[PDB]
Write a protein that binds this ligand. Structure first.
Ligand code: SF4
Ligand SMILES: [Zn+2]
Lengths: 143, 431, 107, 66
């Protein structure tokens, strides 16, 4: 159960030296999207409670309301591991926190995090609403 | 509105795995009606001349201006044709402007110049105009009524003048549960950055139901429609375009899976040039034409989405008025376009159109509840009132390639909220 | 004389092979059809832009915006350059109706 | 005939029905009737007792490379 995905993540991350988003880890193991975020949080909590000095880097996502000049906007950001709490304190209302990615050796910008999702989409084209939380009804291939 | 409701629950996602995770359903779109039939052109015969359009514009717009000058200057009326005027006598004239500007290019950045004349023109003759009138706020093609007298040098002295104004507006039924509508413009696929790529990915991931907690997934499930408004492929130089339609087909596939989508042609898009732009041909989209949730529509677009009626363009009239006038605020130019009862008054003189001959279709025959624009450089929204009970919400849609901002319109409270997307860049706060 | 007794043989837009039926593409060159539609609509687009710049210039050289143009001035380049774009547009509009319509029109 | 050819030539130059040298004669007659300016019921009653003749059912300058 737990050792299954724990060993799968430990060979995907530290051995093949890859970059694991939640959508890649849900197209590999055939899992729901929210359960995949929970899986990644489980792995990072276990290996950060075990050792505290791993070769492990995280990136999160923060979403929520804001007011700049009167108006109420809705700001959504993919954030690094240092700057989380300041971004959390700038916001007014908080609406979504989960985990986005983990790494071995630190990147410089948000470059390859689009390459990964794009390439795993490229071969998997007959399903994108397969693991989606919203299942509409009138959209079935007809024409 | 939206982000208020998105925090209305409990948060489950910083937790170890569970037995179940919640799912939802897309809200039904149980009423829709396209009523943009005067812009869909089936016959398309050229070989006429542009004089049939001005004549029917004057003949249709004349009783509105007579009926407004009566109740705006008193029913002791002095409305008179341009030839039956006697020297130095008080009268009202209804005509068409023509602005005589040099620096406008002929066949062989603003273009307003400190000297340029206005000329009031009717079907038979013209007359010059001076007095108390704005020289640089007005453009060629507006039809208006005016008050004054013929002086001795053949010119005309103007005291005050009036425009046509808003058309009637029937009231809409109120709604039970709030449904939202998302508006995007100008993705710019073909060039324009890599932060735009992650911005487009995060936008489609939010609306399809892949991102965020049960708050975001409950609130994005209520978004009923998606409208993409023009300028889908921003082009760097024509003489590239073949590889971009593949990626646009993939994106429209990933959106046609969950939501209904409406796609409009823009300034650069593979269609014609004249103003009732016809829909895109389906032979450039192999993948996305599998589903009956994708629709391709005219550049001028009317609809009746859940009782609320929409009308919009991809921002070709507003920038044309911006070229040959002095107004800067795009929301103001949109409201001014509403005030003279014409979607695009500068056509045809500096913005090309088809040569119609039966009826000019850019005159408003009714008043829309929402009226939006296209590729404007910054967000803006406003509410305006009519003389009668007429209220109109005005939205200017930003351009996604620079700002990365879209708009949510509520269909029960009739308000508009911006949404912005920003991944982290090459940012290091220790330098 | 003989020019009236036409047959008007249709031709493939890709490789110029005369054939029976009205479809635009050839059976060997059918896959590359989205690119062949992409090509030539950027030509119709540039003919449309040339019609409008010319036929409204006569309205400003004439004086009036509400009455017909009558000027067959043989020393003006405007005359007979405004005559050929009508036929270029007439021809290029009919070549794209080889392809079907992009939607219905009687709804 | 020869009196019916001046009535149509008089309908074609009256400015209160429109600027018409690009279209047919009966289309301009119905355009004015829709807006109901005042089309007279005699320029209709010669466009019905004829077939498709090009010297009744055409504008005055339907030659003339303008
Ligand atoms: S054809 Fe040439 S000379 Fe004649 S009105 Fe047009 S622009 Fe002027
Ligand atoms: Zn061929």
């Amino acid at each position: 159960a737990d050792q299954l995905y724990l060993e799968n993540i430990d060979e995907f991350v530290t051995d093949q030296n890859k970059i694991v988003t939640y959508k890649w880890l849900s197209y590999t193991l055939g899992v729901h999207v929210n359960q995949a975020k929970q899986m990644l949080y489980d792995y990072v909590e276990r290996k950060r409670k075990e050792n505290s000095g791993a070769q492990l880097h995280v990136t999160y996502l923060v979403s929520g309301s804001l007011i700049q000049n009167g108006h109420s906007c809705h700001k959504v950001a993919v954030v690094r591991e240092d700057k989380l709490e300041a971004v959390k304190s700038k916001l007014a209302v908080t609406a979504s926190i989960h985990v986005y990615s983990i790494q071995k050796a630190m990147l410089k910008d948000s470059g390859p995090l689009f390459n990964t999702d794009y390439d795993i989409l490229k071969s998997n084209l007959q399903n994108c609403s397969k693991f989606s939380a919203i299942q509409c009804a009138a959209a079935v291939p007809r024409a | 509105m939206f982000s208020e409701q998105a925090a209305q629950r409990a948060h489950t996602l910083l937790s170890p795995p569970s037995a179940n995770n919640a799912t939802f359903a897309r809200v039904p779109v149980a009423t829709y009606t396209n009523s943009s039939q005067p812009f869909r052109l089936g016959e398309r015969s050229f070989s006429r001349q542009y004089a049939h359009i001005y004549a029917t514009r004057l003949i249709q717009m004349r009783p509105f201006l007579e009926n407004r000058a009566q109740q705006h200057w008193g029913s002791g009326v002095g409305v008179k044709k341009l030839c039956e005027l006697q020297p130095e006598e008080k009268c009202c004239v209804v005509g068409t402007l023509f602005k005589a500007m040099p620096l406008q290019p002929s066949i062989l950045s603003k273009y307003i110049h400190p000297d340029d004349e206005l000329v009031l023109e009717d079907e038979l003759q013209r007359i010059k105009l001076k007095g108390t009138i704005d020289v640089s706020k007005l453009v060629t093609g507006t039809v208006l009524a005016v008050f004054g007298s013929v002086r001795d040098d053949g010119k005309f002295l103007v005291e005050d003048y009036c425009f046509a104004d808003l058309a009637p507006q029937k009231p809409a039924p109120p709604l039970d549960t709030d449904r939202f509508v998302l508006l995007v413009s100008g993705l710019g696929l073909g060039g324009g950055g890599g932060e735009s790529l992650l911005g487009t990915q995060l936008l489609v991931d939010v609306v399809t139901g892949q991102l965020g907690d049960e708050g975001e997934q409950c609130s994005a499930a209520h978004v009923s429609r998606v409208i993409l408004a023009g300028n889908l492929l921003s082009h760097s130089t024509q003489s590239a375009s073949v590889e971009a339609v593949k990626m646009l087909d993939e994106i429209l596939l990933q959106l046609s899976a969950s939501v209904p989508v409406d796609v409009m042609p823009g300034e650069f898009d593979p269609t014609n040039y004249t103003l009732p732009q016809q829909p895109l041909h389906p032979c450039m989209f192999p993948l996305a034409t599998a589903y009956s949730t994708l629709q391709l529509v005219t550049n001028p677009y009317q609809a009746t989405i859940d009782g609320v009626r929409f009308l919009g363009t991809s921002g070709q009239n507003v920038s044309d008025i911006f070229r040959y006038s002095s107004m800067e605020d795009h929301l103001e130019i949109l409201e001014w376009t509403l005030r003279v009862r014409h979607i695009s008054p500068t056509a045809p003189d500096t913005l090309g159109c088809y040569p119609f001959y039966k009826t000019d279709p850019f005159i408003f025959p009714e008043c829309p509840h929402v009226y939006f624009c296209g590729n404007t450089p910054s967000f803006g929204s406003k509410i305006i009132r009519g003389p009668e009970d007429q209220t109109v919400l005005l939205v200017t849609v930003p351009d996604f390639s620079a700002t990365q901002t879209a708009c949510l319109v509520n269909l029960r409270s009739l308000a508009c909220q911006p949404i912005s997307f920003s991944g982290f860049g090459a940012e290091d706060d220790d330098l | 004389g003989l020019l009236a007794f036409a047959k008007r043989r249709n031709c493939c837009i890709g490789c110029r092979t005369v054939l029976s039926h009205q479809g635009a593409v050839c059976e060997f060159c059918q896959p590359r059809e989205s690119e062949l539609y992409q090509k030539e609509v950027s030509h119709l687009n540039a003919l449309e832009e040339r019609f409008s710049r010319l036929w409204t210039q006569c309205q400003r050289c004439q004086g009036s915006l509400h009455e017909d143009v009558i000027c067959t001035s043989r020393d003006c380049p405007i005359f007979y350059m405004r005559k050929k774009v009508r036929k270029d547009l007439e021809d290029q509009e009919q070549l794209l109706r080889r392809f079907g319509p992009p939607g219905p029109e009687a709804w | 005939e020869e009196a019916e050819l001046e009535l149509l030539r008089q309908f074609d130059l009256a400015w209160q029905y429109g600027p018409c040298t690009g279209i047919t004669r009966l289309q301009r007659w119905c355009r004015a009737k829709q807006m109901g300016l005042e089309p007279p019921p005699e320029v209709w009653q010669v466009l019905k007792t004829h077939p498709g003749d090009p010297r009744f059912q055409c504008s005055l300058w339907h030659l003339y490379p303008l």
